[PDB]
Amino acid sequence: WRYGPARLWYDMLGVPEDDLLADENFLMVTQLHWEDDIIWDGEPWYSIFPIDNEDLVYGRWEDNIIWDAQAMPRLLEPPVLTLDPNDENLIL
Amino acid sequence: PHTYIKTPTYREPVSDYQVLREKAASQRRDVERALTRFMAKTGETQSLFKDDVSTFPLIAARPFTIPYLTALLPSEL
Amino acid sequence: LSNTVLPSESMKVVAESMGIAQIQEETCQLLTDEVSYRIKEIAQDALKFMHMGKRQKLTTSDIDYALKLKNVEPLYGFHAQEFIPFRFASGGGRELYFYEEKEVDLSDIINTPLPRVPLDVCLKAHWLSIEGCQPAIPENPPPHELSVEQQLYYKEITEACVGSCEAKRAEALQSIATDPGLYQMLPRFSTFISEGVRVNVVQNNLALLIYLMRMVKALMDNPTLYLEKYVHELIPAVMTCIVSRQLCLRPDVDNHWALRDFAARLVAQICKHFSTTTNNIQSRITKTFTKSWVDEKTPWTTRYGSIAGLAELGHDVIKTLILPRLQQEGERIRSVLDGPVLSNIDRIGADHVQSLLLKHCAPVLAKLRPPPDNQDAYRAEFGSLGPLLCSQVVKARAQAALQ
Amino acid sequence: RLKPRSIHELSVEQQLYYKEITEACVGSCEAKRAEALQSIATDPGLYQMLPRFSTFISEGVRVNVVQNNLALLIYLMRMVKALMDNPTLYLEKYVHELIPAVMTCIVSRQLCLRPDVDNHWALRDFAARLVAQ
C-alpha cells in the first residue's frame, strides 16, 4: 504494498490493509514494406543485445486488460507489488 | 558439440568499483539537477543574471513563520 | 458452541491431594459437570454486581459479593494487589504448575513507605454540549528503494500529473521526456501508470486516463532510458484505453473517442520501436485487435478501439486486416439508417465507427482501384465509403498539385 | 527483493557455433566459407538461432553498402541462399529482414570500377534476382 510506488492510486481507491485471423496475414514480411526499411544512403544497434523479458516474449499482458466494464473480474483490489528489481545497472 | 551440448552459464556481473562509483555519482547528480530545474521552473524564481531562467534557475527564497523548525530539526533519523 | 467443563483429568489430580488412590472415570465425570456448573452460576452472578454497580471490569469484590449470595464461605486473601504468576516444574514424568510463594521480613512491612491519603468524593459541573456541538474545555475529549532526492523527484513528478494545474503538468512531462538519469525510477513509473489505469475500473475518470497516456507518451520520447524491460506494464495500460468499453463517467458527452485514437497512435509507436521477432509484440497486438473485431457481441466502443489501433498500425493492417470485413458496414447501417430505437447511445458510437472506417479506408480504396471510380461507391457498401474514396482521390490530387 | 539472473536462450556451444559460422561466412578462406555454407544449408537445429542470423545479414548489408564492399555482400547473399534451401527451419517469419537486403543489392547507387566492378556486381545481381524469387 500500500505505501510503495502507486500509493497515490491506492489512497484514491481507499484500500488500507497494512481470412483476417489467418496467421499468414500477420507474417512480418507481409506487414512490412521493404523499400522504406532500407536507409539507402538517406539522411538498429541490436543483435548481440544481452537478454529479453519473459513478459515481453510470452506474457500476454493483453489478456490482463478487461474489455467489459459490466463483467470485470479485475476490479477494486490491493494488487500489491512484490518490489523485485533487476534489469541492469541497478546497484544490486 | 552442437549435436548434443547444453551448458547453462550465468551472466558476468560488474565488480568494477570505479565505474560503479561513476554510475552512482552521475545518476545522483542528474536526478538532483532534474529535480532542482523542475522545482525552479514551476515556482517563483530568482536569477544571478538579468532575465536568466533557462540557465542557472534559483528557487526563490521563501520566509518561514518558524525558521528554527526547518533549520535545526533532522529529517533522516 | 458446546457445554464447556473443567477436564476430567483435573479431578484425578485433586482426588490424590485427598488421598484417594484410584477414582474411576465415571466418578470424575460426575465431579466435573457439577463444579463447572457452580462456576457458571458465580460467573454470572458476579456479572450482576459488575453491571448494577457500573464498573465493566469484574473486580474480585464482585465474586466475593456473589459467594456471599450463594451462602458459601468466602475466599480469603484476594483483595491484595497481585496478578497471575505460574511456575513450571518439569520433573521425571510429572508435569505441573505451582505458585512459588516468597517470604519477607516482618520489620520490612512495619517500615514500608505509606501510600498517600485518599480524597473524598466531590462534585464537578461542566457543559457537555451547548445548544449544539461540544465546547473545547479540557473536561471533554480533544476533537533497496529510492534515495531521498529521487524519492522527492518521484513524488513531485507524479503529483504534478494528477490535475491541479496544466502548466506544472506540461513542465513535468517535459521533465520526463528530457532528462538523462531517470533510470532506477523507471519501474516506479511503470507501476504507477499500470495501477493508475487499473484504478479507472473503480472510478471511470477520462481525464486521469488522458494524463496517464500523456505520461506514457512522454516516457517514450526519452532518448536515454530504454523501455524494453519496463514496457510490460506500459503496453497493457495503453491498450486498456483502447479495447475497454466504459471509458467515460457520462458515456454520451465524454469524448472517450480521443483517448481512443491517442492511445492507438501510442500503441502503434510502441510496436514500431520495440517489435522484434523474438518479441512478437506487433503480431500479438494485431491478434488481440483482430479477435476483438471479428467476434460479434462486442460493443461499438471496443470495436471503435480495435478499428482505430488496426488502422493506426499501418496500411497493410487496413488493407489485409480491415478492408475485407467491409460487409460489416451493412450490419452497422442496419442500426443507423433504420430503427425506431433512436434515443439510445448505439447511434453516436455507430456513426463514429462509420466515420473512422471510411476515413481510414479511403486511401486504401485509393491505392487498389482504378483512377476513374465512377460507381465504386455503388459497388462499395452503402455507397458512402465510395463517396469518401472519391474525396480521398481528390485530396491526393490536391497534394500532388501542392508538391 | 533481490532476484536471480536470466540466461540467454542459446547454449555456450551454440553461441560458439554461431560465432565460428559467422566468422567463416565472411569469407577469409574459401574452405571455411564453403563448409560454413553447407552447415547453414543442412543444420537441423539451426532454428532458435535464426533471429540472430537474420539480424546479422540485414544489419550487415545496410552498413556494408555505406562503403560498397562487394565480397562482404557476395558472401552475405550466399549466406541467404544457404539459409533458404535448409528444409528444417521456418523462414517466412524473418523475410521482413531478408527482402530489403536483396533489394539494395539490386537497386542502389554502385559507383566503383566502371567496367571491372560491373562484372563483379553483376554476379551479386544474379544472386540477388535468384534469391528474390
Short mmCIF file of C-alpha atoms in Angstrom, two decimals, chain C residues 94-282:
data_model
loop_
_atom_site.label_atom_id
_atom_site.label_comp_id
_atom_site.label_asym_id
_atom_site.label_seq_id
_atom_site.Cartn_x
_atom_site.Cartn_y
_atom_site.Cartn_z
CA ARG C 94 5.06 -35.46 36.44
CA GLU C 95 4.23 -32.15 34.77
CA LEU C 96 2.64 -29.46 36.93
CA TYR C 97 2.46 -25.76 37.79
CA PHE C 98 2.64 -24.13 41.23
CA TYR C 99 2.89 -20.73 42.92
CA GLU C 100 6.46 -20.41 44.34
CA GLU C 101 5.44 -18.16 47.21
CA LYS C 102 8.04 -15.83 48.69
CA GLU C 103 8.79 -14.50 52.16
CA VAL C 104 9.51 -11.07 53.63
CA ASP C 105 10.96 -9.99 56.96
CA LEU C 106 8.32 -8.64 59.32
CA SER C 107 10.14 -5.39 60.09
CA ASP C 108 10.09 -4.53 56.36
CA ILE C 109 6.30 -4.34 56.46
CA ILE C 110 6.24 -2.28 59.67
CA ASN C 111 8.68 0.12 57.95
CA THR C 112 7.20 0.32 54.46
CA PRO C 113 6.62 3.76 52.89
CA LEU C 114 2.95 4.55 53.41
CA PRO C 115 0.86 5.45 50.34
CA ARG C 116 -0.74 8.86 50.08
CA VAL C 117 -4.04 9.62 51.82
CA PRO C 118 -7.17 9.29 49.62
CA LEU C 119 -9.51 12.13 48.69
CA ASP C 120 -13.22 12.41 49.42
CA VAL C 121 -15.93 12.32 46.77
CA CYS C 122 -16.82 15.76 45.44
CA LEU C 123 -18.95 17.02 42.58
CA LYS C 124 -17.95 18.92 39.45
CA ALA C 125 -20.21 20.60 36.90
CA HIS C 126 -19.22 21.32 33.30
CA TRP C 127 -21.02 21.82 30.00
CA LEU C 128 -21.03 18.80 27.70
CA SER C 129 -22.90 20.37 24.77
CA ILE C 130 -24.04 23.97 24.42
CA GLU C 131 -27.11 24.01 22.10
CA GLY C 132 -25.08 22.01 19.59
CA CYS C 133 -21.53 20.68 19.46
CA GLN C 134 -19.29 20.19 22.47
CA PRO C 135 -17.13 23.01 23.85
CA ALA C 136 -13.35 22.74 23.77
CA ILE C 137 -12.91 22.80 27.56
CA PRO C 138 -10.34 20.30 28.97
CA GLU C 139 -13.11 18.19 30.57
CA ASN C 140 -14.06 17.00 27.06
CA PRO C 141 -12.35 14.76 24.51
CA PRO C 142 -9.98 16.61 22.21
CA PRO C 143 -11.77 16.50 18.81
CA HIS C 144 16.93 -1.05 -1.76
CA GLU C 145 14.36 1.58 -2.88
CA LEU C 146 14.97 5.27 -3.75
CA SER C 147 17.26 7.89 -2.14
CA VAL C 148 15.51 10.96 -0.70
CA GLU C 149 16.48 13.10 -3.77
CA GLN C 150 14.78 10.76 -6.25
CA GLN C 151 12.01 9.93 -3.79
CA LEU C 152 11.17 13.64 -3.74
CA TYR C 153 11.52 13.80 -7.54
CA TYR C 154 9.14 10.84 -7.92
CA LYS C 155 6.63 12.45 -5.55
CA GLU C 156 6.68 15.84 -7.27
CA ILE C 157 6.55 14.40 -10.79
CA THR C 158 3.68 12.01 -10.04
CA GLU C 159 1.64 14.60 -8.14
CA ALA C 160 2.20 17.11 -10.95
CA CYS C 161 0.34 14.79 -13.35
CA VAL C 162 -2.83 14.34 -11.28
CA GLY C 163 -4.54 17.52 -12.39
CA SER C 164 -4.12 20.52 -10.12
CA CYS C 165 -2.94 22.76 -12.96
CA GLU C 166 -1.88 22.35 -16.57
CA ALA C 167 1.41 24.29 -16.56
CA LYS C 168 3.04 22.15 -13.86
CA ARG C 169 1.84 19.11 -15.81
CA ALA C 170 3.47 20.36 -19.01
CA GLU C 171 6.74 21.02 -17.18
CA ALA C 172 6.59 17.59 -15.54
CA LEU C 173 6.05 15.89 -18.90
CA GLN C 174 8.88 17.94 -20.39
CA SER C 175 10.99 16.76 -17.46
CA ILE C 176 10.11 13.08 -18.04
CA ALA C 177 10.75 13.40 -21.77
CA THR C 178 14.09 15.26 -21.50
CA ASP C 179 16.10 14.10 -18.50
CA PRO C 180 19.22 11.89 -18.70
CA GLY C 181 19.19 9.97 -15.44
CA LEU C 182 15.62 8.79 -14.78
CA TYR C 183 16.56 5.07 -14.69
CA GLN C 184 16.17 3.50 -11.20
CA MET C 185 12.81 5.32 -11.26
CA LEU C 186 11.50 3.67 -14.38
CA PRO C 187 9.95 0.66 -12.50
CA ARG C 188 8.16 3.03 -10.14
CA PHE C 189 6.72 4.99 -13.08
CA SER C 190 5.63 1.81 -14.83
CA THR C 191 3.92 0.54 -11.67
CA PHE C 192 2.27 3.94 -11.10
CA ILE C 193 0.96 4.07 -14.67
CA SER C 194 -0.32 0.48 -14.82
CA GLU C 195 -2.02 0.65 -11.41
CA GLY C 196 -3.49 4.06 -12.25
CA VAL C 197 -5.01 2.72 -15.47
CA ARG C 198 -6.34 -0.19 -13.41
CA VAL C 199 -7.94 2.28 -10.94
CA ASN C 200 -10.13 3.51 -13.83
CA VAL C 201 -12.41 0.50 -13.17
CA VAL C 202 -13.32 1.82 -9.70
CA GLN C 203 -13.63 5.42 -10.97
CA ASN C 204 -14.24 5.89 -14.71
CA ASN C 205 -12.18 9.08 -14.94
CA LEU C 206 -11.45 10.02 -18.54
CA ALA C 207 -9.21 12.92 -17.55
CA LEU C 208 -6.77 10.93 -15.40
CA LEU C 209 -6.52 8.35 -18.17
CA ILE C 210 -5.62 11.08 -20.66
CA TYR C 211 -2.99 12.26 -18.18
CA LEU C 212 -1.55 8.75 -17.81
CA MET C 213 -1.45 8.28 -21.58
CA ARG C 214 0.42 11.59 -21.93
CA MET C 215 2.76 10.25 -19.20
CA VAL C 216 3.43 7.14 -21.33
CA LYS C 217 3.88 9.29 -24.45
CA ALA C 218 6.40 11.40 -22.54
CA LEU C 219 8.21 8.29 -21.30
CA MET C 220 8.59 7.06 -24.88
CA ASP C 221 10.27 10.27 -26.09
CA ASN C 222 13.16 9.98 -23.63
CA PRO C 223 16.33 9.09 -25.56
CA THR C 224 18.33 7.96 -22.54
CA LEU C 225 16.04 5.39 -20.92
CA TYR C 226 15.28 2.08 -22.61
CA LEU C 227 11.75 0.79 -22.03
CA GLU C 228 12.48 -2.72 -23.34
CA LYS C 229 12.48 -4.25 -19.84
CA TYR C 230 9.73 -1.95 -18.45
CA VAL C 231 7.11 -1.87 -21.27
CA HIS C 232 5.37 -5.00 -19.87
CA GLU C 233 3.35 -2.50 -17.72
CA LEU C 234 3.07 0.18 -20.47
CA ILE C 235 1.54 -1.71 -23.48
CA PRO C 236 -1.35 -3.15 -21.28
CA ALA C 237 -2.12 0.34 -19.82
CA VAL C 238 -2.08 1.84 -23.38
CA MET C 239 -4.46 -0.86 -24.75
CA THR C 240 -6.75 -0.57 -21.67
CA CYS C 241 -7.60 2.91 -23.03
CA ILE C 242 -8.47 1.20 -26.39
CA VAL C 243 -10.42 -2.12 -26.08
CA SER C 244 -12.28 -1.25 -22.83
CA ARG C 245 -15.97 -0.28 -23.18
CA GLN C 246 -16.71 2.25 -20.45
CA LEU C 247 -14.02 4.93 -20.70
CA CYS C 248 -16.38 7.67 -19.51
CA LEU C 249 -18.39 8.61 -16.41
CA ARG C 250 -21.18 10.11 -18.54
CA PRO C 251 -20.96 7.88 -21.66
CA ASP C 252 -22.89 10.21 -24.02
CA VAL C 253 -20.93 13.52 -23.63
CA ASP C 254 -17.37 12.40 -22.68
CA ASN C 255 -15.09 12.15 -25.77
CA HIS C 256 -13.64 8.73 -24.88
CA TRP C 257 -13.13 8.72 -28.62
CA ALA C 258 -9.91 10.81 -28.40
CA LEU C 259 -8.30 8.74 -25.65
CA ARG C 260 -9.02 6.05 -28.22
CA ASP C 261 -7.09 7.38 -31.21
CA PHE C 262 -4.37 8.86 -28.98
CA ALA C 263 -3.74 5.50 -27.31
CA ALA C 264 -3.97 3.80 -30.71
CA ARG C 265 -1.23 6.07 -32.07
CA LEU C 266 0.68 5.32 -28.87
CA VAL C 267 0.47 1.55 -29.33
CA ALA C 268 1.48 1.86 -33.00
CA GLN C 269 4.57 3.70 -31.79
CA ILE C 270 5.19 1.14 -29.02
CA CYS C 271 5.15 -1.69 -31.56
CA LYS C 272 7.19 0.22 -34.11
CA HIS C 273 10.07 0.92 -31.72
CA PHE C 274 10.07 -2.38 -29.83
CA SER C 275 8.72 -5.19 -32.02
CA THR C 276 11.44 -7.76 -32.67
CA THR C 277 10.99 -11.29 -34.00
CA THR C 278 11.82 -12.61 -30.52
CA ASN C 279 9.25 -10.24 -29.01
CA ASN C 280 6.27 -10.84 -31.36
CA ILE C 281 4.72 -7.66 -29.99
CA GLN C 282 3.01 -6.50 -33.19
#
